[PDB]
Design a protein around this nucleic acid. Sequence first.
DNA 1: CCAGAAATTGGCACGAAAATTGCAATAAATACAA
DNA 2: TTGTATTTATTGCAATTTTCGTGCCAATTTCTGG
Lengths: 48, 247, 247, 100, 49, 354, 455
Amino acid sequence: KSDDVNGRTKMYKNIVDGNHQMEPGMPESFNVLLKEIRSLGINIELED
Amino acid sequence: EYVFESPKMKEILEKIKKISCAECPVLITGESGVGKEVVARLIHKLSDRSKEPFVALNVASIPRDIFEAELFGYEKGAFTGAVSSKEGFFELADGGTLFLDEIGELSLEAQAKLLRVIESGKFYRLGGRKEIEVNVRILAATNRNIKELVKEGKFREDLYYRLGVIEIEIPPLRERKEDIIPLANHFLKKFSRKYAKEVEGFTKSAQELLLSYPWYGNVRELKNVIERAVLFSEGKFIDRGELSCLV
Amino acid sequence: EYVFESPKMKEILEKIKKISCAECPVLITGESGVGKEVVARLIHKLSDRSKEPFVALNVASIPRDIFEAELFGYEKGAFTGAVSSKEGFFELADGGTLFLDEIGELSLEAQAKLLRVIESGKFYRLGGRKEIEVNVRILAATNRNIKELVKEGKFREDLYYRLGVIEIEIPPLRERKEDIIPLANHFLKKFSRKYAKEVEGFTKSAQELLLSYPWYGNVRELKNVIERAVLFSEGKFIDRGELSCLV
Amino acid sequence: GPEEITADIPNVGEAALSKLDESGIVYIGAEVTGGDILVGKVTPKGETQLTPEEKLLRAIFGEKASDVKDSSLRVPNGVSGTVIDVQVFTRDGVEKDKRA
Amino acid sequence: SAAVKEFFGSSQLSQFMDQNNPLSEITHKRRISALGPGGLTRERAGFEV
Amino acid sequence: MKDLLKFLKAQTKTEEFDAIKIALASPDMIRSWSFGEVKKPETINYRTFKPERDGLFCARIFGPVKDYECLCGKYKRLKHRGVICEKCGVEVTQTKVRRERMGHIELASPTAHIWFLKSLPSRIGLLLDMPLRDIERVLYFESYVVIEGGMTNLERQQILTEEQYLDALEEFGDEFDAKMGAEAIQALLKSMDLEQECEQLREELNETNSETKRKKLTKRIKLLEAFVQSGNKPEWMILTVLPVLPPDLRPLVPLDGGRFATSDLNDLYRRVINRNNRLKRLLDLAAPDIIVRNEKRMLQEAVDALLDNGRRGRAITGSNKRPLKSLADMIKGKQGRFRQNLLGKRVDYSGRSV
Amino acid sequence: KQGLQLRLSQQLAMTPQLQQAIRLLQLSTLELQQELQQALESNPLLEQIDTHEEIDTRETQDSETLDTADALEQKEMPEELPLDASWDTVYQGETTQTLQDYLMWQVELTPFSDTDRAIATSIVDAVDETGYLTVPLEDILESIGDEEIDIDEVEAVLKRIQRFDPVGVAAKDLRDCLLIQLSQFDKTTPWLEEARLIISDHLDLLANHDFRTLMRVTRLKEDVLKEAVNLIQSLDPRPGQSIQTGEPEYVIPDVLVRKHNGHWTVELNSDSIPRLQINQHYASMCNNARNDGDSQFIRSNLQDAKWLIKSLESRNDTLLRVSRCIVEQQQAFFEQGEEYMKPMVLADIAQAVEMHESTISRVTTQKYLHSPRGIFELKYFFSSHVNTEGGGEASSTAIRALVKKLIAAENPAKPLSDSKLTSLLSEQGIMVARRTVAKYRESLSIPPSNQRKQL
DNA sequence: CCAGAAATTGGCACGAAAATTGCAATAAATACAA
DNA sequence: TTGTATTTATTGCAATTTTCGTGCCAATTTCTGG
Ligand SMILES: Nc1ncnc2c1ncn2[C@@H]1O[C@H](COP(=O)(O)OP(=O)(O)OP(=O)(O)O)[C@@H](O)[C@H]1O
Ligand SMILES: Nc1ncnc2c1ncn2[C@@H]1O[C@H](COP(=O)(O)OP(=O)(O)O)[C@@H](O)[C@H]1O
Ligand SMILES: [Zn+2]
């Protein structure tokens, strides 16, 4: 409902098709936060 | 374009086609008037630098004192009288092809000025302290036997092995009996429109005389004879009488 | 990139290794296409001046009347044209190596103009009233027997011992039979890789032919012949027929 | 080039231009709802290269269509009312229209 | 002129007149404020003022 | 990719993970992150309205401004996907890669990281066991510090003023080594050892018994053991390369009239780039040190302002006397990512009324 | 004698003393700013006036460590509420939907297969902002990436896409777009079959405005032809312009011209005039007590900075003088618009300001003037002339304006040709040849006489 | 009504006028130490 | 009483290309008699 860019489109398509099911992903704001923390010279990364 | 009829000319053209992909310098040997410059221009067109400029120079007229000045250019303070920097022939031919007419006549002393430029491609201007790198393909044409000059102590063998990587031989017109009639017809057609004489062809006697003659000046002498015949004829076809310039 | 399979080449390499810390000028003598430039650059690389600029200059490329200006530079007001202070090639290679290519062709007059610079490193510019101290290691290359030219009177004996602290002789390739096969293989590999050719070696008859011809251009002639064969190659293996220019 | 306030918009129907006067501005007393045009304006779209297709379009449908694009003022969605007052402000040296 | 325009247009004590009704305008014009340039702030004001 | 179906299927994947790891970044890591180096402080051309080359919005570094088109326009459609134009250098791909491509800036001289100097207790001062006053004086070119003790009576961390350094230089000559700036601190951090300090502090704690000094020794030993166990290195606390944020996360605000205005982050980046370029030019001409020291101090201050504006001394403000927001401001506070966008957010399929 | 010799000579030297501070006139404001940036980078003694300011900040900042009891102890109110709520309980843009976004939204909600969806994605990628397909289907088939697919599948997917909203989008050419639009109409439409026939078969005749061969071939009357043509003209030639995404681009003027007290005042745009300054801090250490190398360095850099500042000031003065002279000469244009602009060449301006024509040419390159009428170029006011009966002159710009005005007020059934346009200009005193009139008409992209008639 | 016979336009060429750029370091007036 | 180093004061020519107007003519649109 907020910032899963692919999830929004998939949810809308499924609702129109009559299939009330979602495929969640990663919010975009967390990726923005990762980039902003990296811009400070700190190495933060998703593991495995 | 250019007309090639004899088997030797076809073989030369095929070899040129095969070696056009090669960037090696070429040395061409023959006589005066055999068409070495035409072959060089064909080679330049058939290579990948056809769009690139082609600079052909007759090195038999360059003064010895300004030899380095013309070849390498110079800076502002190189000598007296100069106020501005000047480019060199290699730089002017950078990214293209440089052709040298009558390389056999070159002086032995000046042959040392081209020992390193051909291989290394790096040189300094007069009055300068900066090294310049280029990419120029060297073509040389000569009517003299280079190897004989080397053996008789007149040519620098290092420069020979620098240029003697690809060899081309153009036989004179005396071995081109098949390729006399097409050249004569082409020259007649060209000069008929050039001088508005409207002459079409030749008669049997004129063709026989032109074919039987062992031309020494080759294509140049044949073209001059055709031009003189055009200038001094009024008929539709040129007979043997109008060809009185020959022996 | 450089093949040293002959025992003499290994001896030369070991001597070069022993003189890496040696700073004295060296003189190299050999024939055409033996590898004087390669050996000199290997000496330069193995010395303490590996990262220092390596200024290679040919003495014959400078006009006679501006030779001093190109050798030492000039100051302002020295002559009609001395617009500003300019340094010479010796000051250009400060702390590095200066490579005098083809020192044999140098005239007697020029050899008397550089007797104090090599031994002491001090020279005055044209118009400069201050003494210039420079430290450049000098490597000279020649294709002439200088030890005989000093006797014949065509070379100045004073400069011979200034450039005769260390002398290197490169034997001709026709005596270096351990190099012909490896050099031919390396050249064939390089020219096949560059020309997109599907050839990957010689035939046994071709190998026997390459070890019997009396090469005169030595390594350079071998490279030229290999390139000529690669250009006109028509099979995965090169036969004696392609190398018909030898004998 | 300058934007023009005009009543001749190439890409609108005649019904949508019924409420505009000869200067391209709505009449006093008009009842308008969301989506209606209040002031008609056009904007230059540049100098498109005269390709054969562009020449065909200009030949068939006219030149005004191929030179300008619509940038009119429209009633926002969910807004209705009656036009009771119109004011025009013009810079010095610019020609005044009929409404002014 | 710049200082005068800034004061009369973008000061904290210069405000659009409240115009709901006449009482709004009368109340707005008779208003006293402890805030502004040289006054207090609603975070540092206190409890006794 | 060759088959377009798999190519489209593989750009909507979700990354798999089960943990998050944080550490310090070496200059090699920062260089491996980036796609190019930023060299010019310009952003937009204002004549062709296209990004400048090597600028803060360069398409050769950060990506295409249009989907599957390069800057010049030789390659334009999906049939040329994954192709680098040899004329402009722009890849042919999606324009969303401008959200996840970073750049880097090569600094002329080292600069300290303001977070590892001003977050109490100071990490540099705790590792080197020096007061914060001395480190601040050295970093901002107000005093000297000895790097190598030498054969004289100068200690390995002794602070020397101008006159003291002058007389020491004229007395001892070239026996010692004294420096100022971030280079000196980096030299101290690079030349130290951790195991010897650990064992010495452990033996000192074993022998000497105290209350405050025992706490100090415990703090230092904990810091040393943490640094040893972690893969970090002390000299990584001094910046040599500077990361640059992707351009779509710091967009330019367009206004009616064609004015692009400016953003605080872009302004701070431009100031850093200008100072770095001027110092790079000055170092090449062998200019007198009396000017290059001021240039290095200004570069240090600019980097500090970019990383965290207002934490150290004065704060750089805008035209209307408002301090510029830095990266830390974007991260922390009640207006930062955590409070405003991650712990709560606005949603679709919602309404409100009386 | 040929030879490079070093000698002492007594010769005469010409005066090439030029080519200094001359390249600063031909550049625009943006390139001039770039050059100034380079100069500031290379010279430590040059600084430019800025606006950034720095002020001290030492106020304490509240953190979480403040205990809960202390919060209730304090009489003051918190600066920001810890609770995620407002006091009653950086700018970024927004996403916009383009034509391709709308098309992909419709593609997502259509029962396609995976292969068909990839084909549709490629097709929509190959659609421009006017609504037409910019590549042949062969390129799309090549970009699909496998050889198991024919061209009929691509055609079917394209036909499905062409029925999206707007109708006619992703069409190959104009005829295809018009036929697609017509296929959506009902058969009850009166003039449908004739319009369909005209579009399908004879569309170039309508482009050439024949109206004679057209009726002969289609065997129709004049009224039915007019009705069909009006129906065709009611269609949308650019279906992809319903969703308009764009913004106009502007140019910041270099010279401002206004009218005060009935007099034309000309000045420079103060928001864009370049300027520099001398850094006093570095230049204030130029004392002999310091090192001599430092002293010579600072002296050289200060002299260069002062010279550059003088050159910039002179450039600004020259530009202002030239603009003022040009405005003064062309005064009737600013009061009555076009048709009143007198002919002008660089020689007149150079004589008026006592300079060479090269200086005038360089100063007026890529310079823009703002007037109450609009934004123009400084070079726009120079034009040729055509001799007018009685010794007068007529500028080509005025003649073009007159020709456009005459053509814009003609009878549609009888378009005015070059022969009649010359006669109208002949009776006004202008003596302009037919070829020149045709050239002027072509320069305005106006069709010839036979291609402007209407029914 | 229709076919044979008259205006229209844009390419190409001519001379002449106008816009463009390659010349990159100089010279004259003024103050100070012997 | 003078000879030298410093500070301002120098924004124009001459090739050279590009463009201006205008006439000739060949491939298209209009005018008139059986
Ligand atoms: N060991 C080697 N391996 C490969 N190539 C070699 C070797 N020795 C010589 N060559 C080749 O020999 C060629 C000529 O070398 P070089 O320039 O030293 O010749 P030179 O005539 O002695 O030089 P110079 O006259 O310029 O002093 C080069 O193209 C080089 O590749
Ligand atoms: N294939 C050809 N077709 C037409 N003319 C040729 C051909 N070959 C040679 N020639 C003529 O022969 C002449 C030889 O000129 P050039 O090559 O300059 O001198 P040389 O032959 O002595 O090198 C040229 O002028 C050219 O016209
Ligand atoms: Zn490109």
